[PDB]
Design an enzyme around this catalytic site. Structure first.
Site, PDB file in Angstrom:
ATOM      1  CG  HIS A  31     -43.184 -20.094  -5.256  1.00  0.00           C
ATOM      2  ND1 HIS A  31     -43.135 -18.795  -4.798  1.00  0.00           N
ATOM      3  CD2 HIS A  31     -41.917 -20.428  -5.591  1.00  0.00           C
ATOM      4  CE1 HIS A  31     -41.888 -18.364  -4.850  1.00  0.00           C
ATOM      5  NE2 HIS A  31     -41.128 -19.333  -5.332  1.00  0.00           N
ATOM      6  CE1 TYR A  32     -40.984 -16.069  -1.079  1.00  0.00           C
ATOM      7  CE2 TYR A  32     -39.836 -17.925  -2.066  1.00  0.00           C
ATOM      8  CZ  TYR A  32     -39.935 -16.567  -1.830  1.00  0.00           C
ATOM      9  OH  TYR A  32     -38.969 -15.727  -2.361  1.00  0.00           O
ATOM     10  NE  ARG A  33     -41.425 -14.128  -4.605  1.00  0.00           N
ATOM     11  CZ  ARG A  33     -40.376 -14.043  -5.411  1.00  0.00           C
ATOM     12  NH1 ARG A  33     -40.445 -14.543  -6.647  1.00  0.00           N
ATOM     13  NH2 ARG A  33     -39.250 -13.482  -4.985  1.00  0.00           N
TER      14      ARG A  33
ATOM     15  NE  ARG B  17     -48.774 -20.375   1.512  1.00  0.00           N
ATOM     16  CZ  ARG B  17     -48.101 -20.207   0.377  1.00  0.00           C
ATOM     17  NH1 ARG B  17     -48.206 -19.075  -0.319  1.00  0.00           N
ATOM     18  NH2 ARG B  17     -47.329 -21.187  -0.063  1.00  0.00           N
TER      19      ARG B  17
END
Ligand code: NA
Length: 181
Positions: free
Chosen positions: A128-130, A113
């Site tokens: 998604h941020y997770r 990431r």
């Protein structure tokens, strides 16, 4: 077809080193599974062109690993830039998972990431941020019942698609071996 906001996006990158500010992405691969980890589709497997000056930053581990796997030769011959690789990957993902729904999935996936934030922010934004980090479960299993880990092994070839297939296989193994749901 099996388009669903529950599907999971798996991604693995190869790089010229460990530092996103200095190094570059040289391979990317994606896989979409459903929420039960069944592989629905494999995405573009892209060797991303980089000039010799960027390949020349590679240390011995990277040079020997990526040369012996054939990746360096594929990078030198590639006509695909980061931007075109983003375009191909987004065109694939939009057929299987809606934007902003899937966590990023893989092993120690925070490292990938970081490279996406720096070099491919348009693709990073699709997640998604997770994070679904299979190595979180690896590390908890090592502490709580380490004998479990003798029942699974990886080849670890650093070919991005084969390595992300091993990530999915590792999580499937944990589903049966350490989870009760
Ligand atoms: Na990786």
């Amino acid at each position: 077809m099996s388009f669903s906001d529950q599907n999971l996006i798996w991604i693995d990158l190869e790089m010229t080193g460990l530092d996103p500010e200095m190094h570059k992405i040289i391979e990317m691969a994606t896989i979409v599974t459903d929420s039960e980890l069944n592989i629905l589709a494999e995405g573009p497997v892209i060797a991303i062109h980089q000039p010799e000056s960027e390949l020349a930053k590679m240390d011995e581990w990277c040079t020997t690993t990526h040369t012996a796997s054939g990746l360096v030769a594929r990078v030198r011959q590639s006509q695909v830039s980061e931007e075109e690789a983003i375009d191909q990957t987004l065109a694939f993902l939009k057929q299987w998972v809606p934007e902003g729904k899937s966590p990023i999935c893989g092993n120690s996936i925070g490292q990938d990431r970081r490279f996406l934030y720096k070099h491919m922010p348009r693709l990073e934004a699709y997640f998604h941020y997770r994070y679904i980090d299979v190595s979180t479960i690896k590390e908890l299993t090592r502490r709580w019942q380490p004998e479990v880990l003798k029942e699974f092994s990886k080849t670890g070839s650093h070919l991005a698609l084969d390595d992300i297939r091993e990530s999915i296989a590792e999580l499937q193994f944990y589903r049966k071996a350490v989870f009760k749901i």
